[PDB]
Symmetry: C2
Subunit: 97 residues, 2 copies
């Protein structure tokens, strides 16, 4: 199914970056930065934005273990997907006026 | 990017079922049923299970407007993906 394909992909993406160092199933700041730069580059306007990454790391690491675990990563993905969905919807609503 | 491809897919799937009736951007119980049966059938052990769909509807519709909006739908997707990831990680741990 298209949905479970997407779910599989969320899992794969995470594990593509989380296994370079430290906990194999959590993202370090470095691994997160890597993932942001390669996977969400449009959100960084294809710029390097370390201070922004720092803030993303701080907002996502809710339990303060200096890692972004999978639950924490999914919080990111959910927020950015909702925001994009909302964008597309408002663009259609604006058009129908 | 693989990630943004997946995010796009989440949006497209929801909008694939949400536009049959009512709000074009929310799932009725009926629309949610169609989505669950087409997209998550393995979670239903490939059975039709309207009693479980009812409970799923009731759980996802946190604002009690009788619809599952996109945010509500992503709560389900997050929960299921997290559970699936946990499964795959515990299967690896077990193996070692
Ligand atoms: Ca790691
Ligand atoms: Ca954390
Ligand atoms: Ca609808
Ligand atoms: Ca609702």
């Amino acid at each position: 199914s298209k949905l479970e394909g997407a779910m599989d992909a969320l899992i794969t993406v995470f594990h593509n970056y989380s296994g370079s160092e430290g906990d194999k199933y959590k993202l370090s700041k470095g691994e997160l930065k890597e993932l942001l730069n390669a996977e969400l580059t449009d959100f960084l306007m294809s710029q390097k934005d370390p201070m922004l990454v720092e803030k993303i790391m701080n907002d996502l690491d809710s339990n303060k273990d200096n890692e972004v675990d999978f639950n924490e990563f999914v919080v990111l993905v959910a927020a950015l997907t909702v925001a994009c969905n909302d964008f597309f919807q408002e663009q259609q609503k604006k058009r129908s006026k």
